[model samples]
Target: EGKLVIWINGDKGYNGLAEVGKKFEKDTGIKVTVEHPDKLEEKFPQVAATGDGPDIIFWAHDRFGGYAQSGLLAEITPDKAFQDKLYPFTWDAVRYNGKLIAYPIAVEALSLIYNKDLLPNPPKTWEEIPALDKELKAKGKSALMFNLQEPYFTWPLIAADGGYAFKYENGKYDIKDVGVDNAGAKAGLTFLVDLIKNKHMNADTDYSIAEAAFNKGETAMTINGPWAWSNIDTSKVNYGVTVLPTFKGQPSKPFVGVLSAGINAASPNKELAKEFLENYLLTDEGLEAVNKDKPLGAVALKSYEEELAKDPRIAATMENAQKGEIMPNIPQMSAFWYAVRTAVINAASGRQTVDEALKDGSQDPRVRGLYFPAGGSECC
Candidate 1:
């Protein structure tokens, strides 16, 4: 009927979506207006509050808090069946206050991607990584790498150790029982510091040097995902991916970043948007475009494993996702990030022992150290 307005904040692989949009219009006879903004978040939020935004929009669950809480998000709880078919972590992102607010489209997770010729097998846990690092160093090699000052890289370890940033009580999130200083968190935070202090890890692990170092055979392993596989020069190296090892049989919990698409509550063309999402968005045609052009461990509409097996580099990324934890969509999550990450980073910098950092970090006012979802919402 009327023109459907859609706004995209990201570039999906050389304008891959552009082709899809054209085909969609040709088949359905629906006109779609697509806008790529330089500052979309700043502009989008304001438009959403005014009830005058695009018919459909793509965004991360964390960024839509105000709009979601204000009841501006359309209830797509009807799409629950399709959502059920998606990955658990991907489905978790679109939920807000027990309601389905968005349709999660893609996912991104980190893993301990390494050169197969270097270690041959992934370290079984975080505890083993240090020894592995030492062994590699004895061979005159750099042991591991990760971007310094990044929270997600360390957050997974926190979750794997039975640590949580906030607790859920009475169906509401409270920051008072934050688990920043718990024993599990202490272990996770301390281990990160030890890795850096013992010459087992390097801080200067930006993307520019990661593949080059691994490909050149200078460094054996690093924290990376599936996206790096396509950009790498694999001519000289025998590289493969592996699951990150753990400490005490507890796996590290990495944060999952995702882009979820949802129908706008104010859209005049609501039915059309929903139809598009149900049939085309998760179809092989749409997912194949993403898999072929942009592969970052994005949850395949078809299969996460099958897609990775087809590409050797991404296989490791999938391995890591299988073991990673889902970052919750709680608003108090903001405070958790500030306190916990600082604790780990300070410990890594040798400014404080892991205990001091954990004590300082675990005291979020909104955290109760556990997530009970109902009666046991109070945290210690």
Candidate 2:
């Protein structure tokens, strides 16, 4: 008799959701509307703050912490049978302060995308890269490049030597204990800077530049995700996907991200939304239909293993997701980007020594947002 609304930031996922919504409406007689509004990411906080947001919101896992803590998102108790259907690790992204808050769709991580035509054999480790770099330059090709300003993209390098955004211990996160400036981090950052200094990678690459170059076949390799699948397909470059190459003796483990959906706390239709979620959206038909509009990574559902094996990229992402570090979903994670992005830029550009840059970055006022005093953790 009533209606429910869902909001997503992009249209790719919207069309499929809207299609499934028609089925939901037919089954339950509840009208369902899916909207991909302009600037939804930036505007969500403002809308939720006023209790004027959609009943359901579909996005990545990162924003749930702040919203859940601030009482903008509703707590969800997924059916235990359904919960057991998904890979248990995926649950880590949807819980905040010890309560379930969202249902995740897929697990994604940065993987190596290489042009098969440019370099038939991809480098498997840091030591293998320089030799290939020299070979690529001989034929006027560059080796690897990605957005230098994004800490999200750069974390694998930092992680190669055991760096982390925040310390997670005994089932909780420590916000004040930033591990970005440690000696292991220095080794990682030093490697990135050396890549530029030695001319093994591009120095001025942004997200678009790196993508464009790779799409045009001007570059042999890049670290990227399934989101770039269409771009590579459109560019018609014969490419292969693999897990990120190892750096030093350690593996290049990028931050694993989950695409997820949740309900608004202020919505009057929480039960309706939950019904739609459990019965309509979480089913294979609803989740599978979105692939044409948007390429999903390895889904968190264990039921699709045989189905996933058909796609090589999916297999690679699943392999990476199996070993990658999960991005912490605490509110303090909101403070991580600004600090680490600045440090990556400074250190990569030679504007500051690795130690100097990381040390300065961890102290930026924005970076220090809500650091608790030395005591029992308040950063859950």
Candidate 3:
């Protein structure tokens, strides 16, 4: 092959990869060029379907399931290098129907970011949240705050007691059995509503509001991802990061997402792409260069993870991800987001009762025919 074309989302990582591409061309006589799309996630499917896509594409792990299912991505063999280098969960994140569809690059997840001035030591369990709530309110402050309207953040609490969007089986999701309305879900969600009524939390708090509260030290803690750190005022707010507090003695599980690279199924140079990914892109030196541009999230390689952990911020992100559940990226999940998010928002805002919100939102016309053809899944 004369050259290999790679496509990556137009983010900070693109500039770093451009430098790597130049080195890659020098190392191996095969020329490499990088291209970035303004909206890769939206444009990739259309371009890839026409057989005009790049040999390699970089994006999030969640897209692998739908892309692989649609035949837009090539299956990658988990060779010795692949198996030995990455964290086990990072591999799992890039798998679709038990097949490796992508090479994981970096990982990120939500964690409890606490204001150290307000809480020198963070609470380990939900039982402790109420007392801290009382203490904070007594002093005219907020205890905990998060995006109450978004299920993405709220799901961590619901998942603490084993609530999930679907029943996963044999590397695939059982679309016929939704779990968001299960007994465990009720127990978990009930505690969330109780916080609004009794704990002095604001039901109207959105992501920005909650983030601002914690940043300004108006709130003791907030559950957010690594991306939120950019907005944090480190000089003013003495902060600490850890996994979400346990609920009912069970660990609260946040959804972990890995940003990865995948080969396009229709690429003209599969062999070269495979070699580049397995032998180069995921290599220790390759990953180090990628991190050099944006040293934020943890890379998948164990050695790089150790190197990044030298910075307490990277360590906290990785530590939280270690306890998190991989986000389900299956095509069937398209319905779950809208249905459950609406239900949670409505219930929390008093627009409807929790039972009514769950029942109506799950059975809403928007999702009625979308879940399972057999028609028995409890959606919300």
Better of 1 and 2 by lDDT: 2
Report how far off residue 365 is in candidate 2 (Å).
5.4
- Residue range 21-85, candidate 2, lDDT tens digits: 89989998888988988768557878989988789998778878878888999998987898988
List candidate 3 segments past 4 Å from native: 1-59, 77-83, 130-134, 137-140, 169-172, 197-199, 229-236, 264-281, 289-298, 309-319, 360-380
| Candidate 1 lDDT for residue 171 | 64
Displacement of residue 79 (Cα, Å) in model 2 is: 2.7
The best candidate in terms of lDDT: 2
Candidate 3 matches the true fold with a TM-score of: 0.75
Tens-place lDDT per residue, model 1, 55-91, is 8876656655546766666877545567656777666
lDDT at position 89, candidate 2: 76
**Cα lDDT, all candidates:** 0.67, 0.81, 0.78
- Backbone clash total, candidate 1: 24
Better of 1 and 2 by TM-score: 2
Separately for all candidates shown, the number of backbone clashes (residues 3 or more apart, or on different chains) is 24, 0, 0
| CA shift of 71, model 1, Å | 4.5
